[PDB]
Amino acid sequence: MRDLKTYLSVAPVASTLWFAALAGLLIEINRFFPDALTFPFF
Amino acid sequence: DIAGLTPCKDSKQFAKREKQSIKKLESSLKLYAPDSAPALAINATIEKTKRRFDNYGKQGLLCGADGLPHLIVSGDQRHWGEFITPGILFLYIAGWIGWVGRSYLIAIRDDKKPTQKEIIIDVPLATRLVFRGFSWPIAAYRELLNGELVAKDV
Amino acid sequence: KKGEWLPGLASPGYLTGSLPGDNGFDPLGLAEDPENLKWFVQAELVNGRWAMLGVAGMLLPEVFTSIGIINVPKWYDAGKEEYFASSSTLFVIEFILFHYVEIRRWQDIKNPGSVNQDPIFKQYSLPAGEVGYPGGIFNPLNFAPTLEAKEKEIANGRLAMLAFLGFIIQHNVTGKGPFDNLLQHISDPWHNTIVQTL
Amino acid sequence: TVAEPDRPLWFPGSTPPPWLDGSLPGDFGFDPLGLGSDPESLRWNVQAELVHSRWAMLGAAGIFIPEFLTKLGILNTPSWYTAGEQEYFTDTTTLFIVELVFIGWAEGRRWADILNPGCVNTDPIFPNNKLTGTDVGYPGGLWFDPLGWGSASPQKLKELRTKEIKNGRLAMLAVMGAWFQHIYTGTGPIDNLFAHLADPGHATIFAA
Numbered sequence: 317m318r319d320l321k322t323y324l325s326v327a328p329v330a331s332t333l334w335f336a337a338l339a340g341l342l343i344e345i346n347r348f349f350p351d352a353l354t355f356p357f358f
Numbered sequence: 359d360i361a362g363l364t365p366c367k368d369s370k371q372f373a374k375r376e377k378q379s380i381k382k383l384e385s386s387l388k389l390y391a392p393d394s395a396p397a398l399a400i401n402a403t404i405e406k407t408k409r410r411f412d413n414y415g416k417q418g419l420l421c422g423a424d425g426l427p428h429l430i431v432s433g434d435q436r437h438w439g440e441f442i443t444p445g446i447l448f449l450y451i452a453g454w455i456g457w458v459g460r461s462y463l464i465a466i467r468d469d470k471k472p473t474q475k476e477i478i479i480d481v482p483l484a485t486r487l488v489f490r491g492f493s494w495p496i497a498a499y500r501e502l503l504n505g506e507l508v509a510k511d512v
Numbered sequence: 513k514k515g516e517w518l519p520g521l522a523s524p525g526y527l528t529g530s531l532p533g534d535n536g537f538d539p540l541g542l543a544e545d546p547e548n549l550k551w552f553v554q555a556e557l558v559n560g561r562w563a564m565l566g567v568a569g570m571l572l573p574e575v576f577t578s579i580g581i582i583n584v585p586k587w588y589d590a591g592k593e594e595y596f597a598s599s600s601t602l603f604v605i606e607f608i609l610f611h612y613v614e615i616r617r618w619q620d621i622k623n624p625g626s627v628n629q630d631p632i633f634k635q636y637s638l639p640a641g642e643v644g645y646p647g648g649i650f651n652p653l654n655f656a657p658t659l660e661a662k663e664k665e666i667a668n669g670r671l672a673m674l675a676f677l678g679f680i681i682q683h684n685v686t687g688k689g690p691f692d693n694l695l696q697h698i699s700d701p702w703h704n705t706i707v708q709t710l
Numbered sequence: 711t712v713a714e715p716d717r718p719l720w721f722p723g724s725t726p727p728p729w730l731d732g733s734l735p736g737d738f739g740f741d742p743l744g745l746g747s748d749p750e751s752l753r754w755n756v757q758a759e760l761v762h763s764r765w766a767m768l769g770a771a772g773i774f775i776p777e778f779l780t781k782l783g784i785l786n787t788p789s790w791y792t793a794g795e796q797e798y799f800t801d802t803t804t805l806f807i808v809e810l811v812f813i814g815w816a817e818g819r820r821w822a823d824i825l826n827p828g829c830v831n832t833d834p835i836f837p838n839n840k841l842t843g844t845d846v847g848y849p850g851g852l853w854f855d856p857l858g859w860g861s862a863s864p865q866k867l868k869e870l871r872t873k874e875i876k877n878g879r880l881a882m883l884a885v886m887g888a889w890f891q892h893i894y895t896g897t898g899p900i901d902n903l904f905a906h907l908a909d910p911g912h913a914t915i916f917a918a
């Protein structure tokens with residue numbers, strides 16, 4: 317259990333989790349706010 | 359307007375592009391039964407197209423003779439949304455990331471085996487440190503003044 | 513027991529408990545270095561005081577106007593009004609004066625006690641106080657600057673800084689005044705809320 | 711706090727894992743994936759199983775009792791599955807934000823208790839009130855144990871806590887049961903019960 321959390325902390329796994337979260341986030345942002353060349357809220 | 363451009367709300371070429379795009383998607387739409395799912399998808403792309411061109415027209419983008427938005431990065435206050443404002447947002451996020459990573463490296467540097475935490479992340483420490491990036495500009499400014507930002511005689 | 517902003521959580525070691533308003537709250541470690549802690553003590557003092565005055569001058573003229581006792585423009589609409597001087601002139605006045613005063617205060621932050629006397633009148637100096645609490649002419653009623661007095665100054669300052677934040681963001685979303693917002697809420701609270709405001 | 715070597719296990723004949731000695735209430739030796747293998751995670755998961763158990767018991771009540779009464783000529787309460795869509799005296803979102811604030815307070819103090827046992831027992835306004843519990847997950851005090859049934863001898867507290875955890879496990883399985891039933895079948899759980907009682911050989915999973 318402790319060893320498994322350790323394995324899940326290793327560089328490639330933490331990287332896939334981190335960038336997968338980041339990708340879902342950016343995808344959803346471009347889903348609710350698509351296109352957009354500018355920051356329109358000023 | 360600026361640089362000889364014209365607002366995209368006033369550009370014939372811009373409206374011609376919106377027209378030709380929409381008619382193109384409708385040419386694809388004529389092939390499918392209007393109740394079908396490909397039809398609903400092409401309708402969604404059409405609505406998204408209208409939203410796109412209408413938003414570019416609204417927010418004041420200038421167009422070239424090509425009928426396409428051109429960005430004014432000179433700093434002209436009418437166009438800060440095109441670079442300066444997203445640029446400040448970027449610098450905030452990038453400064454956040456780098457400040458947090460630097461905080462982690464400083465935190466593990468006196469460990470008995472530093473490289474050990476560079477290949478296997480100390481996630482509790484990382485979670486403790488991620489939100490320091492929220493105030494990274496004050497922290498880094500204070501470090502610059504205090505002399506903790508730059509290593510001495512390097 | 514000096515008070516805990518998070519009950520379970522321990523205090524940072526660098527928050528001794530000798531500072532007024534010390535509830536052990538520095539989760540991002542901004543005040544870990546002591547010079548940072550001094551500077552931020554003065555910063556919290558000045559932001560808190562200006563925030564108290566500002567929140568007052570934004571909220572009370574409005575409630576007076578809405579009651580009808582007086583007629584004063586909204587705090588955000590006060591800028592557009594006509595005055596006996598060009599707003600540019602007003603700005604240059606304000607800038608010159610603040611440029612003098614703030615730099616004297618700053619001289620006290622760096623080298624305490626150094627600016628305590630009138631540079632014009634060599635008499636009429638200030639007594640030796642603590643950085644951020646000038647005595648003498650600045651305390652005509654000669655109140656006792658003790659704990660609980662400073663703690664109340666900091667408490668009202670923090671509540672007023674939060675208050676100001678609420679005023680600007682509120683007015684941004686609602687397009688009205690803060691007391692107008694309070695009336696709208698007290699009207700039908702379960703149906704007049706930031707939920708319905710968005 | 712009493713080891714129980716010869717306790718009845720979930721898998722008769724099997725050997726219990728060394729981190730389950732029978733001291734915990736509801737210890738049948740079941741952790742085949744070693745999820746409570748280290749003491750820290752077992753502590754955490756004991757609190758988890760407890761909270762899940764209590765929420766699932768309240769939920770089993772809120773599904774099964776009103777569905778059962780409204781199935782009779784007693785109440786008019788709607789189906790638990792669709793109760794979220796209903797319009798109450800205000801919008802559900804603002805109700806939910808209320809919920810996140812107050813529940814956030816309670817869960818926050820419980821949180822401080824797990825991370826720092828005892829540090830959270832005093833009323834931050836009226837200190838003379840306080841809480842009597844000395845074990846995490848069983849806070850005691852006038853609020854959470856007014857009848858005092860919670861402060862008692864060991865072996866009695868082990869009996870009662872075992873009852874609580876077993877009821878809560880059953881209730882977890884039952885709540886998810888009504889969930890997957892209402893998704894699979896088209897009715898409330900009591901209709902599944904009656905339809906099954908009429909023809910148990912046929913009206914089952916395999917009637918669809």
Ligand code: CLA
Nearest residue numbers: 432433434435442446449450453494495496498499500502
């Ligand atoms: C190629 C040379 C050049 C340069 C360098 C500039 C530079 C600038 N121009 Mg100009 N421009 C140029 C050519 C140039 N221009 C030409 C040839 C034209 C003719 C077309 C124009 C016409 C033009 C116009 C009409 C205007 C400008 C404006 C501006 C300013 C906009 C940015 C600003 O307002 O401040 C910066 C804005 C901020 C909000 C500052 C905050 C950002 C912070 C400091 C960075 C964040 C970092 C981080 C968070 C903190 C750091 C921490 C650290 C201590 C570690 C800027 C200084 C505008 C201006 O004057 O603005 C008033 C404007 O009116 N430009």
Ligand code: CLA
Nearest residue numbers: 674675677678681682685686693694696697704705706709
């Ligand atoms: C300084 C304290 C304070 C007080 C008591 C109020 C009071 C009120 N706010 Mg405001 N607000 C505040 C701060 C405060 N706010 C801050 C700091 C912000 C910036 C995020 C906002 C931004 C805000 C928005 C966007 C809106 C309100 C709105 C409202 C009204 C309805 C409440 C609501 O809809 O959700 C409340 C919204 C919040 C953001 C709450 C944040 C306040 C924090 C949690 C401090 C309060 C905790 C404190 C210990 C409890 C009360 C203490 C008080 C007696 C001093 C209400 C009269 C609504 C309104 O104007 O009605 C039309 C609404 O749209 N507020």
Ligand SMILES: CC(/C=C/C=C(C)/C=C/[C@@]12O[C@]1(C)C[C@@H](O)CC2(C)C)=C\C=C\C=C(C)\C=C\C=C(C)\C=C\[C@@]12O[C@]1(C)C[C@@H](O)CC2(C)C
Nearest residue numbers: 538539540541559562563566569570587590673674676677
């Ligand atoms: C100065 C100020 C407001 C001043 C307002 C003024 C003068 C108003 C002036 C006028 O109204 C008049 C009177 C008349 C009107 O007609 C015109 C205007 C112009 C409107 C607010 C400060 C407001 C300041 C605020 C809100 C500061 C908030 C800081 C926070 C919350 C920091 C918290 C933490 O930093 C700690 C402490 C520890 C870290 O580890 C973690 C984090 C969380 C980072």
Ligand SMILES: CC(/C=C/C=C(C)/C=C/[C@@]12O[C@]1(C)C[C@@H](O)CC2(C)C)=C\C=C\C=C(C)\C=C\C=C(C)\C=C\[C@@]12O[C@]1(C)C[C@@H](O)CC2(C)C
Nearest residue numbers: 741742743744745762765766769772773790793882883885
């Ligand atoms: C089943 C469940 C969990 C099951 C977990 C299992 C089997 C894990 C087993 C193991 O891991 C161990 C232990 C050890 C490992 O080595 C091996 C395995 C095998 C992996 C949780 C349910 C948990 C269920 C919960 C918490 C239910 C709570 C219900 C609430 C709060 C109320 C909801 C409602 O209010 C609404 C929303 C609307 C109303 O109309 C109706 C009501 C019902 C009132």
